[PDB]
Design a binder for this molecule. Structure first.
Ligand SMILES: Nc1ncnc2c1ncn2[C@@H]1O[C@H](COP(=O)(O)OP(=O)(O)NP(=O)(O)O)[C@@H](O)[C@H]1O
Ligand SMILES: Nc1ncnc2c1ncn2[C@@H]1O[C@H](COP(=O)(O)OP(=O)(O)NP(=O)(O)O)[C@@H](O)[C@H]1O
Ligand SMILES: Nc1ncnc2c1ncn2[C@@H]1O[C@H](COP(=O)(O)OP(=O)(O)NP(=O)(O)O)[C@@H](O)[C@H]1O
Ligand SMILES: [Mg+2]
Ligand SMILES: [Mg+2]
Ligand SMILES: [Mg+2]
Lengths: 311, 465, 119, 56, 462, 469
């Protein structure tokens, strides 16, 4: 939605991945602020990624005609890099929603009638001609990340409904998590991917992920019942679900490296093995007596026992 | 000169009549076409006039599939609205909206007289001035919700809980006890379920005493709106020229209003509130006001109801409900115990249950049933968790009487024979009051309660016990 | 907000079709023409500073409405003034949870970093 | 103590019996508000759509 | 004064020619149906059809009546049921009325009105005892369906024989079964020999439903302007509002909230501002109106209920939860007010029983929470029981105020609740053989009799 | 022949074409086909089935002289085809000789027959509690995810022994997803009795509009020649979207949510074509499974309630239960089948009543009665074990006989001693035990379609329980 935290995560991604990955990187901005776009070029000129990266801009201060084609310009570059040269390509595309939104503003003048909320009638036809161009082929592999802004923080809107049909993995952000102060604001419940299959992630991944997902689904209604029924009228076995789900949700927070301006902290680094390992311990019962507030904005699980030592 | 087509947009077709000899609104026009070569396709579409547009131009809504029309083809005139044959030929057969029969039992000859559909309603000086209660012979229905000759009754119930046998019982009872004619109309109903209904009628020997009209779901909205008014003519002609009580079942009024919505969206009228037509209150009223009772007979209708989102304030339920005189409900929680029919005794309401209409004793006996069943309805929750024997004398007597009012509801029917062999029985209306008065006083409390199952007279109950 | 209403009622008599509300769909464009006019120019340009403090009003404090969400997408932050804290005795009634500022600690004296950088 | 423990369960019975009632009224009134909000939303949407269609 | 019709769409027509046609004029088609003109464009005239439009074709001749919307009035319509256009319904020959009134006439205004101090005897205890009405007042009857609104109007109109008030009953969008039941009740009781019944059923086109109340008030005020008193009742304003929405949406006007056009406050005002109590420049007559409004879900906050309240001087909101509780009519002691002071009632009423409203509303709220309050609760059940009455039992006003005095003074505290309604029927059998003088004293002096004798009367019965 | 005047968004208006019929094909010089959908006084509205970027004003348009035709044939099985008769997988032509019109009339009421012979997919929940017959149309409604495609894949895969020529259609979907599904099917050899129709997002919306009509036209030929046919839709609501776009571009008057009122017609003109034909024409049968999109479970929406009226039942998939463990997320409360109770093997009918007498009570009592800790707790525990035993792992279809065996094992009360977490192991190790115990029960259920002797049926359960670990 609006002001949830998309850009910090996307810049963490381009910091972590492009610095190691040898693929040609293209970052295209469709609807964000000009200040971020101008700052990113200087940050690139310092980072050393400028040798292997190209950028396209134009941003908000222009009518819809430029905001529509600015998305496809970077894809036009990545297409030549994939089809002929054959190296891997990274493609970050930022706020493609404004490709849709721009199409609304001209539509009323082009003779098309309004539809539904007010979007132009050619939503699917205009959007498909774009979403099916960015694909991986047998000749080369394209890895593409996109930013989507929900028009009114509510997902039952024709634009998100039309966008939902093309992604291979989606992560949702809820403004409630933004207000709770547990960043990033990814809601585990509605975040799904094709990778959660036994032949890709293995059995050591599936059971733990499913147990954590199911526990976080179960806590959702009990915490609402608590709001009226009280705090000890519920049974102790039921209260244990909250007692552990609070820790599980708090440990989801991470101290990022690009948020040093907002955090004032350098961060920490974790590999996936440590993530599966740490969730297994948190379900094992090894950390029942450490305070919940100690789990806020930490990386590797080994840090938590230090922070309690700090307290 | 016959009309000519100049404009086709899906279900809606415009026609032209040179020299200004246009036809009237709600007339019927027919088209007969055959391929002269492979470059043409055969079609026999018919149209209904709905609006004039000037410059000798008329708007029409299609009654069937409309593909293959060509600019320059001709449409012929009829001079009258759609007409259905009436008389002895109508009984025992099934027809579509246009009139032709759907079975393979041949056509209907051209010498039989045919009656139109669109006609003015009966006037003020011809209405019946007395509340004559129709006799149904069904034990619960004759007590908790008497039917009024000329009035309307709505049906609610659970999924598949005897929604079709309660209709086929009434036709047989009308034929046996008073004598009459019944018509069954399907408003945009499924083509598949028509076969099931036809066979379940045929194995009961009841189709011979009724006439039926179907409009399938694959038909365009122009024809799906006209089926009820189509059957109304067959129902009315036997109340006009011959004289006897006539029934007219309507399967679902929701799809009638929804067909109105579809055709109004097609006609170019701006949607009213919640998208319905602006003429919602007058297009329905023309149907409700033809079903009346004059001094010589009556048309009475039974209708099932659907609700859009359980929103009673929605325009369609809001405009329908005020026109209904009775409403009854069916519960599956009782049907699971085998109490056929599982009619709800508490959700069923009717305006006729008044002392001025039914007399003092029948009013008292009808109301006290609902009064005394409430104690059971409320105590069932505590009964379900603790035993009865520890309760007070009032709870015991309430359970003791309620277990018999609960099972007395049932009655074997004539259609029940083909799956449960029984002769079939009837409940006299004058005897129903005596019976329920005698039960509610506790004169039959000593009989075993489940012996009260599926029969229509207390004396037979005594014999069976 | 009254300027948005003035633009709406200016557009309506020109015989231009409406959109999501009575508000025309060009509103975002208009605001993009306005708020982006500010700049913090570099050393080779003059090194000035033009900062703005726009005010926006919404009916019943509905932050999810069309104009509030449209406006938020452009600015570098938001101070949300909530009416139900106003009477409780917290003046100004700035909501410390919902308000956001994008530039953060870039322009701030270094004494405050050592003390209340994350308060 | 036995008398008090019996009166405690009696008081709890009464507390739940009062608590279980106002819920249904609150649901019925919110559901009515829900249908009114629906109908208003659909009416506004159709009015905007037909105004746009008439304009174009 | 000739032309041709070129559009016959959905009960609305467009006509060529008609050079001299005026706004609001009556028009006749060659088919024999009446219509009217509401809009005159540069080269065409819009016509609204007041009957069966299935017989109109393009090119039909259409003709000018030559006058504004006049409906016939007079004494010859008494004893007949008439169509709003001026046609008898049940036959019995053509009407002989000569005089006519335009139903669009300008309402009387400043220097033509006067306060209200005299009651409209309704005979329904719970209304006159709690929510009084006076001549010239406009009282809203509003509420839910299937609760008994019409049973109030019928009783009120039967009770008017002793006050000599010619009256009109209007039925809009209604089913003929109830219409003829009401007509049979009136002809049985004889009310048709001074009342006039106008009907416009649900099987009739919308414009008749839209015009019916205007004729119903135009044929009623004529007797006012000649000095007589008139009572007018309308069966439903909600159906008229729906018919106006239908007509406006066929006319392609921009809908507002709930698709109801903005003329709603206008249309009803031009209908409801005709009621007045004329000054001495015309006569002392007065007219009172009882319009009806049906709520879709029983929620007052809707558009039409509030807009209709805005004009009227009061309302009684009929509930449905009271209907199944064993109380009829469903009258709420809470949110129902009349703006006329207590002096409108006869002086005994204000003198003694004016506290009934407080006594009843306080109990109606206090029962929800349920020595002093224990004693207070005992009175409420009697306060609601004594106000109960059955169908077609209009109690005389003298006996009415006498039983209200007996109730308000605590004479009934010994009688058990279930027997209360028995006392009420036996008590009147007592006075006619023991207290006949008090009735004539009440009728003449409009004031309470001697307190000592009134108190002494009751002990004989007790 | 005529000229084109207006072009845009794949829609064209042409002047000329005097004798063009409604639905007649038209062609341009560029070779892309088009369909006439609106016939005005001086212009004809042409809707284009392919890439339109190359058409210019002033181009000539030629009348083909025929209605839509779709080639059909048994050799097509295995091939992946467009909704139009063109090859998409390559490998030469489509190997067809006869072509069918798309406008085939629905069967009459006297040409049908009652249905009592079942269809199977291999899932304990759907195959039993919401049964489907070999002449039934059944509705699947839901939001994105919750595993709707798994139902189609199980319905197609499980039809190995029981002959059923199948047509799977994927409308408006990304081509990578359909290729992944095709390869997953290829691992089980489903291409020997399946045909796939795909129209990608890049393809014009008219192909999405025409796809399900071809998904029934290609499948009715085996019926009318006397073969049993199944048709499954990946998503049908997308129809409306395409029908919206063109209808709005053609300037047809709006409706409730810009859906023109023709939707009821447009769906029905297809969905009524599934039937169990009579012997006067041919003893074939056809069944269909339409799919509908929904926004966060708002079942009261326009299109969902529109499609509910037509079908003989409903299977709604609920998202907040999708994470409770039961997959696919079929709820026994909202889903009923009007045709159910007849299309079963008599082994199932003798037992399902007790299964409901546990489940229908549990699925309403559990939400509030679970907190308070003989008969009521026994009901609670039994219901817990039932809702545990109905689950299934990813893509392991089961034949009908093992389904009825385990349902009989559960309902009779012999199963409630295995604890809650181990049930998923038990339900499979029974499957492995039965084969080493004997095939005679399995043979009897296969031949007579009736439960075997209970006195002998119970012995396998008794012998297993003596050795379960
Ligand atoms: N780890 C963090 N700790 C504290 N604040 C944070 C953190 N991450 C993000 N934020 C804050 O959240 C804001 C999110 O900015 P941004 O990502 O641009 O919003 P957005 O989600 O992209 N909405 P938009 O930019 O309009 O599409 C930042 O400006 C910070 O103020
Ligand atoms: N005061 C009353 N006491 C007893 N019975 C009554 C009373 N009023 C009405 N009834 C009965 O209840 C029925 C309903 O009254 P009725 O006046 O027809 O309601 P209504 O106002 O017409 N409802 P509606 O048609 O929706 O406006 C009457 O026919 C009587 O039998
Ligand atoms: N029984 C099951 N158990 C576990 N996971 C399942 C099961 N059935 C399906 N899935 C999951 O279903 C996913 C496939 O996507 P799916 O949820 O079916 O897409 P869909 O939205 O429901 N249908 P579609 O519109 O074609 O994408 C896989 O990641 C599986 O993990
Ligand atoms: Mg951002
Ligand atoms: Mg009434
Ligand atoms: Mg899928």
């Amino acid at each position: 939605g609006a002001g949830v935290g998309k850009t910090v995560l996307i810049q963490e991604l381009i910091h972590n991945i492009a610095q190691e990955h040898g693929g040609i990187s293209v970052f295209a901005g469709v609807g964000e602020r000009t200040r971020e776009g101008n700052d990113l070029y200087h940050e690139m000129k310092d980072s050393g990624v400028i040798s292997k990266t190209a950028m396209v801009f134009g941003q908000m201060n222009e009518p819809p005609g430029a905001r529509m084609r600015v998305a496809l310009t970077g894809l036009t570059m990545a297409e030549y890099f994939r089809d002929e040269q054959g190296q891997d390509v990274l493609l970050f595309i930022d706020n493609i929603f404004r490709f849709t939104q721009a199409g609304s503003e001209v539509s009323a003048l082009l003779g098309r009638m309004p539809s539904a909320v007010g979007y132009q009638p050619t939503l699917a036809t205009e959007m498909g001609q774009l979403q099916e161009r960015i694909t991986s082929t047998a000749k080369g592999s394209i890895t593409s990340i996109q930013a989507i802004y929900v028009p009114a923080d509510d997902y039952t809107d024709p634009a998100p409904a039309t966008t939902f049909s093309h992604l291979d993995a989606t992560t949702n952000l809820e403004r409630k998590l933004a207000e709770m102060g547990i960043y990033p604001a990814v809601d585990p419940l509605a975040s799904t991917s094709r990778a959660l299959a036994p032949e890709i992630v293995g059995e050591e991944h599936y059971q733990v992920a499913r147990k954590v997902q199911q526990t976080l689904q179960r806590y959702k209604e009990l915490q609402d019942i608590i709001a009226i029924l009280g705090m000890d009228e519920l049974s102790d076995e039921d209260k244990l679900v909250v007692h552990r789900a609070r820790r599980i949700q708090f440990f989801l927070s991470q101290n990022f490296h690009v948020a040093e301006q907002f955090t004032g902290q350098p961060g920490s680094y974790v590999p996936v093995k440590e993530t599966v390992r740490g969730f297994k311990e948190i379900l094992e019962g090894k950390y029942d007596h450490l305070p919940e507030d100690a789990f806020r904005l930490v990386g590797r699980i080994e840090e938590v026992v230090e922070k309690a030592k700090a307290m | 000169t016959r009309g000519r087509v100049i404009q086709v947009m899906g279900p809606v077709v415009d026609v032209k009549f040179e020299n200004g000899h246009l036809p009237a609104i709600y007339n019927a026009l027919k088209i007969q076409h055959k391929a002269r070569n492979e470059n043409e396709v055969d079609i026999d579409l018919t149209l209904e006039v709905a609006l004039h547009l000037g410059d000798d131009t008329v708007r029409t809504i299609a009654m069937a599939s409309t593909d293959g029309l060509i600019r320059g083809m001709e449409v012929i005139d009829t001079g009258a609205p759609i007409s259905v044959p009436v008389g002895e030929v109508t009984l025992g057969r099934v027809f579509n909206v246009l009139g032709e029969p759907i079975d393979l039992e041949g056509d209907i000859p051209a010498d039989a007289r045919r009656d139109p559909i669109h006609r003015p309603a009966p006037k003020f000086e011809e209405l019946a001035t007395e509340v004559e209660i129709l006799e149904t012979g069904i034990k619960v229905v004759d007590l908790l919700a008497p039917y009024i000759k000329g009035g309307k009754i709505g049906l609610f119930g659970g999924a598949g809980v005897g929604k079709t046998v309660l209709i086929q019982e009434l036709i047989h009872n009308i034929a046996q006890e008073h004598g009459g004619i019944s018509v069954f109309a399907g408003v945009g109903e499924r083509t598949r379920e028509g076969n099931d209904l036809y066979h379940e009628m045929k194995d009961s020997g009841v189709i011979s005493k009724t006439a039926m009209v179907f409009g399938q779901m694959n038909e365009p909205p122009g024809a799906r709106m006209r089926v009820a008014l189509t059957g109304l003519t067959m129902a009315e002609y036997f109340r006009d020229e011959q004289g006897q009580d006539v029934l007219l079942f309507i399967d679902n009024i929701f799809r009638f209003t929804q067909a109105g919505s579809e055709v109004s969206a097609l006609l170019g009228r701006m949607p009213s509130a919640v998208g319905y037509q602006p003429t919602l209150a007058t297009e329905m009223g023309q149907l409700q006001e033809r079903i009346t009772s004059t001094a010589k007979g009556s048309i009475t209708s039974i209708q099932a109801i659907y609700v859009p989102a359980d929103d009673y304030t929605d325009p369609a339920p809001a405009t329908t409900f005020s026109h209904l005189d009775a409403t009854t409900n069916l519960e599956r929680k009782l049907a699971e115990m085998g109490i056929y029919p599982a009619v709800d005794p508490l959700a069923s309401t009717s305006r006729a249950l008044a002392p001025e209409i039914v007399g003092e004793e029948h009013y008292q006996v009808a109301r006290k049933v609902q009064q005394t069943l409430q104690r059971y309805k409320e105590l069932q929750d505590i009964i379900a968790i603790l035993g009865m024997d520890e309760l007070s004398d009032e709870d015991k007597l309430v359970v003791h009487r309620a277990r018999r009012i609960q099972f007395f509801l049932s009655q074997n029917f004539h259609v029940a024979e083909q799956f449960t062999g029984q002769p079939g029985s009837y409940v006299p209306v004058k005897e129903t009051v005596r019976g329920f008065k005698e039960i509610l006083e506790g004169k039959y409390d000593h009989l075993p309660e489940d012996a009260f199952r599926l029969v229509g007279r207390i004396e037979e109950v005594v014999e069976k016990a | 907000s009254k300027q948005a209403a003035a633009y709406r009622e200016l557009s309506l008599l020109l015989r231009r079709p409406p959109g999501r509300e009575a508000y025309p769909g060009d509103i975002f464009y208009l605001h993009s023409r306005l708020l982006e006019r500010a700049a913090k120019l570099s050393d080779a340009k003059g090194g000035g500073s033009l900062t703005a403090l726009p005010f926006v009003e919404t009916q019943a404090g509905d932050i999810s409405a069309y104009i509030p969400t449209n406006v938020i997408s452009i600015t570098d932050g938001q101070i949300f003034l909530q009416s139900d804290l106003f009477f409780s005795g917290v003046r100004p009634a700035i909501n410390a949870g919902l308000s956001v500022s994008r530039v953060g600690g870039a322009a701030q004296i270094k004494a405050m970093k050592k003390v209340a950088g994350t308060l | 103590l036995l008398d008090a423990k019996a009166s405690e369960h009696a008081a709890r019975m009464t507390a739940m019996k009062n608590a279980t009632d106002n819920a249904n009224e609150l649901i019925r009134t919110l559901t009515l508000s829900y249908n009114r909000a629906r109908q208003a939303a659909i009416t506004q949407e159709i009015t905007e759509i037909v105004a746009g269609a008439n304009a174009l | 004064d000739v032309g041709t019709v070129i559009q016959v769409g959905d009960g609305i027509a467009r006509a060529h020619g008609l050079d001299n046609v005026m706004s609001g004029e009556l028009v006749e088609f060659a088919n024999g149906v009446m219509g009217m003109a509401l809009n005159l464009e540069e080269n065409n005239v819009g016509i609204v059809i007041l009957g069966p439009y299935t017989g109109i074709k393009e090119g039909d001749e259409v003709r000018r009546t030559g006058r504004i919307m006049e409906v016939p009035v007079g004494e010859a319509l008494i004893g007949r049921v008439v169509n709003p256009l001026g046609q008898p319904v049940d036959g019995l020959g053509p009407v002989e009325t000569t005089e006519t009134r335009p139903i669009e006439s300008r309402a009387p205004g400043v220097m033509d009105r006067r306060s209200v101090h005299e009651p409209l005897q309704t005979g329904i205890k719970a209304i006159d005892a709690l929510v009084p009405i006076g001549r010239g007042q406009r009282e809203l009857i509003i509420g839910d369906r299937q609760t008994g609104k019409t049973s109030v109007a019928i009783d009120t109109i039967i009770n008017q024989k002793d006050q000599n008030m010619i009256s009109i009953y209007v039925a809009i969008g209604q089913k003929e079964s109830t219409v003829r039941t009401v007509v049979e009740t009136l002809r049985k009781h004889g009310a048709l020999d001074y009342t006039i019944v106008v009907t416009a059923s649900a099987s009739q086109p919308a414009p008749l439903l839209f015009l019916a109340p205007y004729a119903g008030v135009a044929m009623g005020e004529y007797f006012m302007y000649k000095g007589k008193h008139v009572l007018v009742v309308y069966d439903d304003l909600s159906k008229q509002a729906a018919a106006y929405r239908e007509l406006s949406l066929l006319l392609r006007r921009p809908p507002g909230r709930e698709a109801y056009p903005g003329d709603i406050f206008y249309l009803h005002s031009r209908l409801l501002e005709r009621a007045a109590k004329l000054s001495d420049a015309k006569g002392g007559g007065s007219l009172t109106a009882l319009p009806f409004v049906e709520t879709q879900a029983g929620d007052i906050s809707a558009y039409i209920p509030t807009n209709v309240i805005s004009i009227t001087d009061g309302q009684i909101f009929l509930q449905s939860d009271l209907f199944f509780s064993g109380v009829r009519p469903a009258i709420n002691a809470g949110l129902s007010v009349s703006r006329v002071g207590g002096a409108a009632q006869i002086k005994a009423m204000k003198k003694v029983a004016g506290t009934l409203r407080l006594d009843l509303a306080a109990y109606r709220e206090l029962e929800a929470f349920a020595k002093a309050t224990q004693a207070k609760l005992a009175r409420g059940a009697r306060t609601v029981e004594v106000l109960k009455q059955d169908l077609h039992q209009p109690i005389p006003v003298e006996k009415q105020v006498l039983i209200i005095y007996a109730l308000t003074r605590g004479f009934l505290d010994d009688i058990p609740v279930e027997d209360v309604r028995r006392f009420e029927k036996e008590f009147y059998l007592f006075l006619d053989q023991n207290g006949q003088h008090l009735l004539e004293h009440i009728r003449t002096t409009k004031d309470l009799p001697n307190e000592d004798d009134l108190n002494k009367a009751i002990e004989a019965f007790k």
